[PDB]
Amino acid sequence: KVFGRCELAAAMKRHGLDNYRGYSLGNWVCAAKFESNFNTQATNRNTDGSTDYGILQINSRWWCNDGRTPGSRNLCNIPCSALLSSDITASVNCAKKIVSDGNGMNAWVAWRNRCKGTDVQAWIRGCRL
């Protein structure tokens, strides 16, 4: 599924991301835009052989099992395929663990480089939430 911007903001709020660990909804929407262009099915291979899955590009290195990332953990206890669903529950639940692990949203390189410090409220401007 490719979400619209306000549609994803709404879903994110429904699933409890709005101010999760102090990060406003706009942060999460901005991260999703630059990680996956709001496409739940996005996958991208990393140089180290791990793969990033879903709206928030969650990495098989640590967070999900894809059966092809040696020496890998599966800290969200889910098949990485679960992160590609039109239903965002799995991605949201796993992202709550990631953002809680000590470095906040800096875990998402595209958030650090493209969202951090910017007017992230713009991402939710006009949305009925």
Beta carbons of 29 and 9 less than 8 angstroms apart = yes
Beta carbons of 44 and 61 less than 8 angstroms apart = no
Smallest gap from residue 2 Cβ to Cl ion (A): 10
Contacts of 77 (CB under 8 A, 6+ apart): none
Instruction: Tell me: is residue 101 an annotated ligand-binding position.
Output: yes
Smallest gap from residue 80 Cβ to Na ion (A): 9
Smallest gap from residue 109 Cβ to Na ion (A): 5
Show the beta-strand stretches assigned E in 1-129: 43-45, 51-53, 58-59
Structure tokens at 48: 């180290």
Give CA 103 to chain center in angstroms. Answer: 15
Binding site for Na ion (CB under 5 A): 69, 72, 110, 113
Structure tokens at 29: 């929407």
Stretch that binds Cl ion, among 4-12, 22-30, 91-99, 105-113 (CB under 5 A): 4-12
Q: Is 7 a catalytic residue?
A: no
Q: Which does 72 bind (CB under 5 to 8 A by kind): Na ion, Cl ion, none?
A: Na ion
**Binding-residue total with Cl ion (CB under 5 A):** 1
Q: Which does 15 bind (CB under 5 to 8 A by kind): Cl ion, Na ion, none?
A: none
Count of CB atoms situated within 10 Å of the CB of 10 = 18
Among 1, 2, 3, 5, the residue binding Cl ion under the rule CB under 5 A is 5
> Which residues of the shown chain bind Cl ion in the complex (CB under 5 A)?
5
| Residues catalogued as catalytic | 35, 52
